[PDB]
Symmetry: C2
Subunit: 354 residues, 2 copies
C-alpha cells in the first residue's frame, strides 16, 4: 500500500557526504559515522554555514524546546538524540526550554502538574546523555523568576508583535485566553543570548535551532521580530527528515510506542500497527532509518525479502533497534536523580571551547 | 455648565459619620481627623467590612499601582497615594506599590532602561508621601518579575482564566495592539494574591488583599475577584472611592508657588476649560481636587455663607485651591530631597513586612 521498496531505494539513492565528513574531520579531530546520509538529517549548505562559524570562531549555542505531557513516546526522543550528537560533534552550549507554562495554558492541568511533568521529562532528556558542562535545561515557570534578562526580552518581543501577526501565524481567536496570545514571545526569547545573564554574560553569540521546520509558527515569528529589536535571528538546520517526520506523525493515536513499555509491549505494538499532500511516508519507516546504525541493513532486507514478506523483516528490524533503545533508556533514566535534575536546571556559565 | 454651588450643597448635605469614628477609635486607639464625611471619600459599606476584618484580626495588606510617567507627576497622581498612606496610618498594615514600568514601555516610546529609571524616580515622589519604610514594598515590574519565585506563576494562572474578548470590552484593545498590552491585565491582577510575594509574606495562606479603587469603573477588579476561586485563591477585598482613577496646562509637583497660582486662576473652576487632559459625572476636576486636598471640613460650607451675600464663586474657589495646593507641593518638594537613592533601594528590596 505505502510501497516500502521505493522508500528503501530512495533512502539508498543519496550517497554519504564524504566531503563534509572530511570538513568535520579538519575542524574537529572526529570521525562522524551517523546522520551523514546526504540531505536527510540536515542540508549540506546549512552544515557548511555552521562549519564556517565553527572554523571562523564565531560563538553559537544550540536551542531546543519541549512540551511537558504526562509518558514520553519514542518520536519525542528523536530530536534530542540528534541534538546530543550535534553537541558532541562541535562541543557547543545547549539551552533546553521546558514550556511548562505553555502546557498549563493550552491543556487541562494544574500549574503544579505542568511543573511536575517538566521535571520528570527532564530525566528522559538528561538520559539521552547531554554533557552537564555544555547544557542548561530550564522550566519557564522557574527560570522567569530567577533571571535579570529573560523577562526583559519577553517584554521587548511582546511590544514588537501584534495580535494580527500571531492570529495569522497561530490561528488564535478572540475566545482564546490572553496567556496563549502572548506566549509566542516566551518561545522566541531563548533564541537571543542576553535572555540568559548567568549562562552567557556576554555581548553577541548566534543561536542554532536543529530539528527545526521552516514553516513552524514559533520559528516564523521569532525570525520576523528579531531584526525589529536589533537582535540576530536564529540559524535553522534545514532537513528533509524532520519536516517529513512531522508530516508523517500527524496521522488515530492510542497505542503509540512509549518509553515505559516492556520488550513484549514493544513487539506487540509494532506487529499490530507498524508497516501496513501525500508523499507515502510511513512513520514506522522513518523510525527505522533514524534508529538504524547499520548502514547496509535496509538494502540487505530489500534484496532478500519480497510486500507482505518484506514487511515481516521490516517489523522484525524495528524491534531489534527499539527493544534495546527503550530498555537502556529505562536503565539510564532510573539513575537520573532529582539532584541531577536540579544540577542541570541550576543557572551557570557555559563556555565556548573550539 | 457646571453648577459649583449645587455641588457644595450636595457635599455638605452628607453628614459626618461618628459611628465610624467611634468604631475606629475602639479598633485602632486613635481618632482620624480626615476623610470621614459619609459616602464622599470612600464607601462606608466597604469600610465596615474592612473594620470587621481588622476587628477579627484577619491579616490584610494594601495594594495600589502606577504607570511611571516619563513627564513629571501631576498633583492629581498623589491623590491615590495620600489616601493610601492615610489607610496605612490608621490600620498600620503592609502596603505593596506596583511600578508598571513594563506597561509604560509597551504603551510609550521608551527604552527599558528609561522606563525603569522613571519607575525609580517616581518612587521618590511616592516615598515623599511619608509611607512607613517598615510596612511598604515598592517594586518595578521589569525588575521584580526576575527576582520572585511566586509573581510570574500567578501571572500565568490569571492569564489562563482571562480572554481577549474580556479585556477587549474593558480596556478597549484592538487587533492592531501589541500582545504585551493584551496580556498585561494578568500582571495588574497578580499582586492581588500574597503568594506573588514570597519574601514579603512568606507563603502564608491566611493573608488577603485590600484594593482601593474607583466606584463604577471596577469591572476589571470584579473579573479579578471572579478568577480567584478558579485558581484556589481568596478574593481581593475592595474599597470603593471616587478619588481613585479608572483603568503645560496641568499642575506639576515641580511647579513654583506662582506657577500654581497662574494655572489655577487661568484654567480652573469653569465649565469650559479643564485642569487635566483626561480627568461622579456632574462634577469637575477642579472641585474634586479641592474637596480632596481640603482638610478643613467647614471650608466649603463657609464659601457658601461667604458669597450669597459676598464674593464670587470662581474667585473664592480658586483662592481656596491655591492656599491648599501651594503648601502641599512645597512640603512635597522639600521632603522629596530627603529621599536618597539608598532609601529607594531599601523600599524596593524584598523583605518581610509584619502585622499588628
Amino acid at each position: 500500500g505505502i510501497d516500502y521498496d521505493k522508500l528503501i531505494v530512495r533512502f539508498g539513492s543519496s550517497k554519504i557526504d564524504k566531503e563534509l565528513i572530511n570538513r568535520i574531520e579538519r575542524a574537529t579531530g572526529q570521525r562522524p559515522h551517523r546522520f551523514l546520509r546526504r540531505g536527510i538529517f540536515f542540508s549540506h549548505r546549512d552544515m557548511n554555514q555552521v562549519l564556517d562559524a565553527y572554523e571562523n570562531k564565531k560563538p553559537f549555542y544550540l536551542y531546543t524546546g519541549r512540551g511537558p505531557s504526562s509518558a514520553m513516546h519514542v518520536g519525542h526522543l528523536i530530536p534530542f538524540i540528534f541534538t546530543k550528537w550535534l553537541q558532541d560533534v562541535f562541543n557547543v552550549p545547549l539551552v533546553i526550554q521546558m514550556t511548562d507554562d505553555e502546557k498549563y495554558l493550552w491543556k487541562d492541568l494544574t500549574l503544579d502538574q505542568a511543573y511536575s511533568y517538566a521535571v520528570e521529562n527532564a530525566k528522559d532528556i538528561i538520559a539521552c546523555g547531554f554533557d552537564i558542562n555544555k547544557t542548561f535545561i530550564f522550566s519557564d515557570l522557574d527560570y522567569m523568576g530567577m533571571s535579570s534578562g529573560f523577562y526583559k526580552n519577553v517584554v521587548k518581543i511582546q511590544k514588537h508583535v501584534t495580535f494580527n501577526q500571531v492570529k495569522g501565524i497561530f490561528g488564535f481567536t478572540d475566545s482564546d485566553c490572553i496567556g496563549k496570545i502572548s506566549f509566542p514571545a516566551i518561545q522566541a526569547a531563548p533564541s537571543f543570548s542576553n535572555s540568559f545573564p548567568q549562562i552567557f554574560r556576554d555581548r553577541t553569540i548566534q543561536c542554532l535551532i536543529p530539528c527545526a521546520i521552516d514553516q513552524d509558527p514559533y520559528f516564523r515569528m521569532t525570525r520576523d521580530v528579531a531584526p525589529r529589536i536589533g537582535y540576530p535571528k536564529p540559524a535553522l538546520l534545514h532537513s528533509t527528515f524532520f519536516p517529513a517526520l512531522q508530516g508523517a506523525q500527524t496521522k488515530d493515536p492510542n497505542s503509540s510506542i512509549f518509553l515505559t513499555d516492556t520488550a513484549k509491549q514493544i513487539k506487540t505494538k509494532v506487529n499490530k500497527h507498524a508497516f501496513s499532500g501525500n508523499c507515502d511516508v510511513d512513520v514506522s519507516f522513518m523510525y527505522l532509518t533514524f534508529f538504524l546504525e547499520d548502514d547496509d541493513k535496509l538494502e540487505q532486507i530489500r534484496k532478500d525479502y519480497t510486500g507482505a514478506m518484506l514487511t515481516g523483516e521490516l517489523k522484525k528490524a524495528l524491534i531489534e533497534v527499539l527493544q534495546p533503545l527503550i530498555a537502556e533508556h529505562q536503565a539510564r533514566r532510573k539513575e537520573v536523580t532529582d539532584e541531577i535534575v536540579k544540577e542541570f536546571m541550576t543557572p551557570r556559565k557555559l563556555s565556548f571551547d573550539f
